[PDB]
Amino acid sequence: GIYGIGLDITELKRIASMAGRQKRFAERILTRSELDQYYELSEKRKNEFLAGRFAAKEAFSKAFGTGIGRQLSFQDIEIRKDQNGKPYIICTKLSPAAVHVSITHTKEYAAAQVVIER
Amino acid sequence: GIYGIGLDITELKRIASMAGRQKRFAERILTRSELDQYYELSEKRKNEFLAGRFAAKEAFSKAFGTGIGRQLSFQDIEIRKDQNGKPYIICTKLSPAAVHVSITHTKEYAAAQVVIER
Amino acid sequence: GIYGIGLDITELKRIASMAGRQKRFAERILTRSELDQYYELSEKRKNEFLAGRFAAKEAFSKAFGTGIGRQLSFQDIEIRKDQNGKPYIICTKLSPAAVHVSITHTKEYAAAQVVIER
Numbered sequence A, B, C: 001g002i003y004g005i006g007l008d009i010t011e012l013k014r015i016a017s018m019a020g021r022q023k024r025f026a027e028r029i030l031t032r033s034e035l036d037q038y039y040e041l042s043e044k045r046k047n048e049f050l051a052g053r054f055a056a057k058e059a060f061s062k063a064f065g066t067g068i069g070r071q072l073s074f075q076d077i078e079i080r081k082d083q084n085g086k087p088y089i090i091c092t093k094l095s096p097a098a099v100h101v102s103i104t105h106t107k108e109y110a111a112a113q114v115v116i117e118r
């Protein structure tokens, strides 16, 4: 069955502001594997990539049932992708299984949803 | 398996307008348990809370397969939350089981999604 | 279980622009059955209908795992609806089973989500 679901719509301007005020904001949100992908992008694409991963992790934290905080850090969640470019999540604290995720972008937002199966 | 899924993105300004034109709009959308939580909020938070519950119930009505109308009222759906703050839905007309739901907020919208299992 | 999930938020203005620049844009995105429904709408409703179907098909392509391209065309996906107005998807290339979908509209967007079961 389904353990939990999560949805999030993140504001591009907020992510850009936090990145502009905190020199290491991206390192706070992304894992090393995620950063390897992030570092190759333009200033604009970096913001969209980061906002989408931020939305995916907040959505995951809702499906997990705790939100981001004492029980779950942004660093405990990793978005990976298969050979076709389809994203999926790995949260070792949960299990080794792939968790369902989908991301979408607009002019002002980066949105994502997650479904964790039993 | 999955009985149905539902998604909704509600406009904060529309909800605020309806609440401003109808003195009992919140009572139309929310159950007594939901209102107990609503009454404790500021004018601004009330609007966001109400818009999110409205989105969650419209999303539920889509997963249910009928929409809001003759077969389903906003009063037949209740959003509850566990000790961690995770929301879930109860629709007695359907079954006593918890229905999956997730909510997210932006500057102009309150959005939600629902998944009803078999 | 779940084979895949997909989410998409499409910009109404972009869809209107493509339809204004390409005389056969609707025919590119919609199947014959979908067009039969589209042709009956006003200019404004046509745009909203088309944007919602576009979002639903992009969401489906993400759940399918390939995106829209060489392995999947907009024409391979069809949104149908039951007697209550609830939409569902049929992708013959996948299987004859109904695929879960939900659509929602705002002032500037048409959004959709999809869940494909095993």
Ligand SMILES: CC(C)(COP(=O)(O)OP(=O)(O)OC[C@H]1O[C@@H](n2cnc3c(N)ncnc32)[C@H](O)[C@@H]1OP(=O)(O)O)[C@@H](O)C(=O)NCCC(=O)NCCS
Residues within 6 Å of the ligand: A008, A009, A028, A058, A059, A061, A062, A063, A064, A065, A066, A067, A068, A069, B048, B049, B052, B084, B085, B086, B087, B102, B103, B104, B105, B106
């Ligand atoms: C849940 C979380 C991930 C997102 O909260 P947010 O950004 O404030 O708000 P969102 O609008 O995206 O989500 C709001 C909703 O989460 C849902 N929620 C709250 N706790 C939850 C939990 N434990 N499980 C699932 N959903 C939960 C609620 O329904 C709530 O909306 P509501 O108050 O109208 O019912 C929160 O734990 C959080 O922000 N974590 C801290 C991270 C942080 O401070 N980051 C700074 C940048 S590095």
Ligand SMILES: CC(C)(COP(=O)(O)OP(=O)(O)OC[C@H]1O[C@@H](n2cnc3c(N)ncnc32)[C@H](O)[C@@H]1OP(=O)(O)O)[C@@H](O)C(=O)NCCC(=O)NCCS
Residues within 6 Å of the ligand: B008, B009, B028, B058, B059, B061, B062, B063, B064, B065, B066, B067, B068, B069, C048, C049, C052, C084, C085, C086, C087, C102, C103, C104, C105, C106
């Ligand atoms: C489905 C419902 C919940 C939401 O409709 P809405 O606000 O007009 O529109 P939304 O943009 O959020 O959703 C539109 C979509 O619902 C989906 N829909 C319609 N009937 C449906 C049903 N029975 N089951 C599942 N989905 C359905 C459709 O795909 C439709 O978009 P489309 O016409 O492009 O295919 C509708 O039944 C409703 O508005 N109920 C009446 C409530 C009301 O009048 N409230 C006033 C405030 S108190």
Ligand SMILES: CC(C)(COP(=O)(O)OP(=O)(O)OC[C@H]1O[C@@H](n2cnc3c(N)ncnc32)[C@H](O)[C@@H]1OP(=O)(O)O)[C@@H](O)C(=O)NCCC(=O)NCCS
Residues within 6 Å of the ligand: A048, A049, A052, A084, A085, A086, A087, A102, A103, A104, A105, A106, C008, C009, C028, C058, C059, C061, C062, C063, C064, C065, C066, C067, C068, C069
């Ligand atoms: C995936 C697709 C459907 C949508 O992509 P898009 O419009 O460019 O962008 P969206 O913002 O909606 O989706 C972006 C996300 O798709 C997800 N994605 C990419 N490939 C994917 C795949 N194979 N399976 C599932 N998800 C995938 C990604 O996470 C990506 O965001 P990210 O780069 O931050 O990780 C793409 O295949 C596409 O646009 N198809 C071509 C259709 C076209 O050119 N149409 C013109 C109009 S007729």
Ligand SMILES: [Ca+2]
Residues within 6 Å of the ligand: A008, A009, A010, A058, B104, B105
């Ligand atoms: Ca958020």
Ligand SMILES: [Ca+2]
Residues within 6 Å of the ligand: B008, B009, B010, B058, C104, C105
């Ligand atoms: Ca709605």
Ligand SMILES: [Ca+2]
Residues within 6 Å of the ligand: A108, B108, C108
């Ligand atoms: Ca906007």
Ligand SMILES: [Ca+2]
Residues within 6 Å of the ligand: A104, A105, C008, C009, C010, C058
């Ligand atoms: Ca898209």
Ligand SMILES: [Cl-]
Residues within 6 Å of the ligand: A009, A010, A011, A014, A015
């Ligand atoms: Cl945000």
Ligand SMILES: [Cl-]
Residues within 6 Å of the ligand: B009, B010, B011, B014, B015
């Ligand atoms: Cl609305």
Ligand SMILES: [Cl-]
Residues within 6 Å of the ligand: C009, C010, C011, C014, C015
């Ligand atoms: Cl778009």
